Amino acid sequence: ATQTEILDQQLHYLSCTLNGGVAQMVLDRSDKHNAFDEVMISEMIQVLEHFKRNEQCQILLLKANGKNFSAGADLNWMRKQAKMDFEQNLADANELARLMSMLDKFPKPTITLVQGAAFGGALGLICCSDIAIANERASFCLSEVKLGLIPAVISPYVTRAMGQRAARRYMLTAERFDAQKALELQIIHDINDDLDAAAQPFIDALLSNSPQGMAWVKCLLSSLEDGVIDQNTLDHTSERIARIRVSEEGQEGLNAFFEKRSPQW
Amino acid sequence: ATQTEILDQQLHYLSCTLNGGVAQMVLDRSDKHNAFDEVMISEMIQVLEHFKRNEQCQILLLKANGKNFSAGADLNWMRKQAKMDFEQNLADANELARLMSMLDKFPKPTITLVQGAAFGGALGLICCSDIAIANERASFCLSEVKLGLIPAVISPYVTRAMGQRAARRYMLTAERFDAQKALELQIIHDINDDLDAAAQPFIDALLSNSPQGMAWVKCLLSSLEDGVIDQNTLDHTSERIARIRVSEEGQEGLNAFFEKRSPQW
Amino acid sequence: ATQTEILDQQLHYLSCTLNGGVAQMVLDRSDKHNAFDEVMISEMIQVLEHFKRNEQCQILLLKANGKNFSAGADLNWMRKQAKMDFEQNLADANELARLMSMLDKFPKPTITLVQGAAFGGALGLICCSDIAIANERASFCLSEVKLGLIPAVISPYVTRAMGQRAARRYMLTAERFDAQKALELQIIHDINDDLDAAAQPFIDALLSNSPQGMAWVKCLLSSLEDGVIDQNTLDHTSERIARIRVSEEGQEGLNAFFEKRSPQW
């Protein structure tokens, strides 16, 4: 039994599997609508740290069992938060923030597959993923202001995805929105009732490409998030390309192409 | 007679009314195409400062009488600007800049309803609003470069809304664009010939939600405009959610939901 | 024979012409699919520096001969890069970076017309142009990670155009995308099999407008790229409008309009 198989068995709310390059993290609490609580949050951190270490993981796929991806926040968990003081609340929030950050920075391509409702922190995960595909019934909602709250921890990622113009509407109205609108706003990349068929071509493309190059694409895009294009941007982009090209991995990618053979990454 | 009714009577170019949570600022100079001059600018500042203070204002709705929202800049006003020296021009611009800033930062949801032409500073207002709905004949144009000018004061807001890729086209061509293109670029959120029916569902959603939470959504989105997502972003978002949750308002929103009752905000 | 006619004759890979306000830079290496190498890069720099100086150039149009805009990077050039050490690579990259920067900052409206494939650095040029029109067969691809590389030098411009949400997909998958998707992502502004007819209305609009005002629109949009809207943004936008208005050019644009005559720019 592998470390993944052991973790899969010990996690309460998640499954996790690893086969042929592709790791999966699966929301496996359908009986409670995959609703988030402190345990789900923590289990997701653990699975992420597990697969980041793992050399056999080229891609991380996030999915969920049941009809709904997450109905968002567990009511019992919400009652507990309500009784918390500032500092306990801050610690909770910081763990949810650590979850989003580690996903967003995961040094490997991530694909999220979203069926039905994806409410609450789930939208953050989707916005933290590099590729997201939802089914036609997929449902979204930024509801916090209905409860005197705000979606603070997910807002940086959600705003990056959908933009300020749309965030200022949807975060203030707390209206529901559908799959097609999601697609337009670029919350998702594709709509397909067969989420497995829809993911295949992305998985195929991603397993073919340079692990190092994909990790560097991600740090590079990270460095550009601020929108600045000045001398330092120019110097840094030029240094990145020059470095990878002389790297072993850069060198192997080029040689494989010249020699018309498959790269051994 | 209320302070609003008195202001409504004294303003030359605007109307203003207040009923049932909803304040309205209405461009009421149809005879001159709601064209902006120094007086319009100043009256709009006054109405904004009036409703920001007002505790009975949960939402601010901006609308205009006549067939056109604003044909943009008053010709007589333009002749005056032409004769101005640098410093007089700077003062004008700073007042227009103070108008946009105060609207953009207004701590309450704003909805703009745009019929026909919305030229000149009107586009800035629309880009400063949280929700904008236009009719099918709505017309837009960034014309300044046709006159050896630039739309400098509105550009930050307009750029935020439509993005750099589209700003660099439309600000350089000065071409007219239509409602549908507006919608695609996200200058507007909805298209409907019945602007009143179109606003209703947004008004209903907005009056239901936490005034404090909506104000905090707006400051938070403001803080994220730069695109940076670093340690401080993480610390600040975590501090915001923790704070509101323990607030009276946060607490009341949560309790109302647990108790399955309406929040008394 | 003009300086342009002389340059046109001496360039190996480009043509260049100048007529009636409109300068053209033309990729003229169809036999090798307009593929980029060090010489193409350098020739493009020279043509840009040539037309920036030129007072008879109001607009710069970029186009290409043959069926394909650029198949991207020349294989012979790639073999050379592979053998380069860090510092030689850095110099290459810095020249490609200097090319994109000078185009992006060119103080005059640029229009790019893209037929078929536009792979590699070509996408950067397109993303550096103010207006881009492609035909229905136009093809795009960010392929670098297939070779253990990254599109580092073009990424700032490409990211500005299409956004982070889409960059993180396409830069990681290295998938091909088509004209329509390009249009949606705003990589292009229009789709038309008749690229010459499609450019005409933009050329007409651009030759009519203030050269100074268009140059200032561009610096101003540049200054706003970071997304910050603070006191200094406000002060700087107000100073720009006040300055141009009192300028000779500002003054002439206004007077021509008041006098219902054509501006003599």
Q: Do B79 and C258 touch (CB under 8 A)?
A: yes
Nearest-Cα distance to chain B for A94, in Å, is 6
User: In 3-state terms, what secondary structure has residue B233?
Assistant: helix
Q: Which residue of C has its CA nearest to A185?
A: C165
Write the DSSP symbol of residue A30: G
The residues facing A141 across adjacent strands are A176
| Chain-chain contact of B84 with C249 (C-beta, under 8 angstroms) | no
Alpha-carbon distances of C45 from B150, C38, C49, C71, rounded to whole Å: 29, 11, 6, 19
The number of C-alpha atoms within 13 Å of A5 and in the hemisphere containing its C-beta is 3
Domain boundaries, chain A: 1-265
Q: Which residues of B223-242 are buried (b: 16+ CB within 10 A; e: fewer)?
A: bbbbbbbeeebbeebbbbbb
Question: Which helix (DSSP H) or strand (DSSP E) does residue A251 occupy?
Answer: helix A248-258
CATH topology of domain C1-265: 2-enoyl-CoA Hydratase; Chain A, domain 1 (3.90.226)
**Alpha helix ranges (H) inside B163-230:** 164-173, 179-185, 195-208, 211-224
Element (H, E) at A141: strand A139-141
Distances (CA, A) of B187 to B36, B71, B183, B230: 20, 17, 6, 29
| CA proximity to B120, closest of B140, B93, B100 | B140
Interface A-B, measured as beta-carbon pairs within 8 A, has a size of: 154
Neighbours of B74 (CB within 10 A): 22
Look at residues C124, C127, C129, C131 and name the one whose alpha carbon lies nearest to residue C106.
C129
C214 with B145: Cβ contact below 8 A: yes
Cα–Cα distance, C164 to C185 (Å, whole number): 11
Return d(Cα A226, Cα A9) in angstroms, integer. Answer: 41
Question: Resolution for this model in angstroms, one decimal place?
Answer: 2.1
Chain C residues with CB-CB distance to A240 below 8 A: 150, 152
Asked if B89's CB is within 8 angstroms of C242's CB, the reply is: yes
Q: Residue A144: phi, psi to the nearest 5?
A: -50, -40
Whether B149 sits inside 8 A of C242 (CB atoms) is no
Show Cβ contacts of residue C230 under 8 Å, excluding neighbours closer than 6 positions: none
- In angstroms, the separation between the Cα of residue A92 and the nearest Cα of chain B is 8
Nearest to A88 by CA among B249, B248, B258, B246: B246
Nearest CA in chain A to B256: A147
Picking from A109, A229, A244, the nearest residue to C225 by CB comes out as A229
Search chain B and give the residue with CA nearest C253: B147
DSSP secondary structure letter of residue A36: B
User: Neighbours of A (≥3 Cβ pairs closer than 8 A)?
Assistant: B, C
Query: Which residue type occupies B105?
Result: K
Closest in A162, A226, A238 to C97, CB measured: A238
C160 to A229: CB separation less than 8 angstroms, yes or no: yes
> From residue B37, how far is each of A152, B156, B174, C33, C259 by CA, in Å?
40, 21, 21, 56, 20
Alpha-carbon span C69 to C34, nearest angstrom: 6
Which amino acid is it at A45? I
Q: What technique determined this structure?
A: X-ray
> What is the CA angle B234-B235-B239, rounded to 5?
115
| Of the partner residues C149, C151, C165, the one whose CB lies closest to the CB of residue A253 | C149
State phi, psi for C27 to the nearest 5 degrees.
Answer: -75, 115
Amino acid identity of residue A180, one-letter, is Q
User: Scanning every residue of chain B, which has its alpha carbon at the shortest distance from the alpha carbon of A161?
Assistant: B227
Cα(A172)–Cα(B239) distance, integer angstroms = 20
Interface contacts (A, C; CB < 8 Å): 154
Please judge whether C145 and A209 are an interchain contact, meaning their C-beta atoms are less than 8 angstroms apart: yes
3-state secondary structure of A232: helix
For A166, B168, B253, the CA distances from B162, given in Å and listed in that order, are 11, 10, 34
Closest CA to C94 of A140, A239, B226, A171: A239
Distance in angstroms (rounded) separating the CA atoms of residues A95 and A103: 12
**What distance in Å separates the CA atoms of residue A238 and residue C153, rounded to the nearest whole number?**
6
Q: What SS3 class is residue C193?
A: coil
With CB atoms and an 8 Å threshold, state whether A212 touches C152. no
- The distance from CA B187 to its chain's CA centroid, rounded to whole angstroms, is 12
CB contact under 8 A, B237 and A155: yes
> What is the distance between the alpha carbons of residues C188 and C201, in angstroms, rounded to a whole number?
16
Residues of chain B with C-beta less than 8 angstroms from the C-beta of C217? 144-145, 150-151, 168, 171-172
B152 C-beta neighbours (distance < 10 Å), count:
24
Closest residue in B to A96 (Cα) is B238
Cβ pair A150:B206 closer than 8 A: no
A241/chain B closest Cα distance in angstroms: 23
φ and ψ of C198, to 5 deg: -65, -30
CA distance A246 to chain B (A): 30
Q: Which of A220, A242, A247 sits opposite C93 (nearest CB)?
A: A242
CB–CB contact A242 C144 (8 Å): no
Task: Let me know: does C152 contact C174? Beta carbons within 8 Å.
Answer: no
Report yes or no: B233 and B227 within 8 Å, Cβ to Cβ: no
C143 burial level (CB within 10 Å; 0-12, 13-18, 19+): middle
Contact of C191 with B195, CB cutoff 8 Å: no
Q: What's the alpha-carbon Rg for chain A, to the nearest Å?
A: 19
Q: Where are the alpha helices (DSSP H) in chain C?
A: 3-10, 38-53, 75-83, 86-104, 121-128, 155-162, 164-173, 179-185, 195-208, 211-224, 231-246, 248-258
Between B214, B228, B249, which is nearest A225 by CB? B228
